[PDB]
Symmetry: C4
Subunit: 90 residues, 4 copies
């Protein structure tokens, strides 16, 4: 489960990195950062400058938000939870 | 279910597109982009400039956020999930 | 239930409106707008300029986010849902 | 439960405060503010300026969002709810 969500999230982020670095002309790290803060809904950046960028972003959000949060709802629920929970056992 | 949420989400976005293009003077694509990133809570844009725009946005968020996320909670749960899940069966 | 969440959300927004108009010097409508997009996590505005504003915002988010979304999870689930659901009955 | 989430959230915020004040050169209060609005997904600030800041932020979001919202889903569900609910009993 977690491994699958891990991979699916990775692929989604790779696609965004490739897209924004090419169409919005961002350095790869900035393209990855934009993809991440957009899909996690933080959105602490300016918006895309091109219409292609805006259209892709709209579709990218609808298709990737569900997945990204599914992975997060497992990274801290089936991985980070035990680490602390089980450890809270004297 | 999914088809209904699909339509409801579309209508909500059409209303926002019409509103922001008219009152905030945005090109249709920018009005749609603003509507989408606002309802999905990404918010990676400047805020509306007019009071009419601010008031509408407040009401638009409260009435459309629930719906938009309901659609997302189906687009990747009852459509994208099977595609990958069932496919994960050798 | 809905009526209570309605009132609780209103009081929370009134407090934010009063606070930001006074400490950040915003016009009431802008103070309300900031309160709303902050608690719904859209965040499509610049951040507070004063330290008092930043500290209050931190506390305001932690105490009001749960409530605001609880109200939203009722405004479209126990009010908007029936309107469309029941109506989807020929 | 609540006490644990309380502590875990505190530690996460302390780490962010230390990181952003050092690497992004922010005053402690601004570093704390950035950490808070980023993990709660409000994101009403400009993004980090350094690559180190961007990379850390990506990891910080994935590891801290689940926790922060878990705490919020308890601060208003097992603490703020009773205060109002039980009080709604004449
Ligand atoms: K958000
Ligand atoms: K934002
Ligand atoms: K911004
Ligand atoms: K923003
Ligand atoms: K946001």
């Amino acid at each position: 489960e977690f491994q699958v969500l891990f991979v699916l999230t990775i692929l989604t982020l790779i696609s965004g990195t490739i897209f924004y670095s090419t169409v919005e002309g961002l350095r790869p790290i900035d393209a990855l950062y934009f993809s991440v803060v957009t899909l996690t809904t933080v959105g602490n950046t300016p918006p895309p400058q091109t219409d292609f960028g805006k259209i892709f972003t709209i579709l990218y959000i609808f298709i990737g938000i569900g997945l990204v949060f599914g992975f997060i709802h497992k990274l801290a629920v089936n991985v980070q939870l035990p680490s602390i929970l089980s450890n809270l056992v004297p």
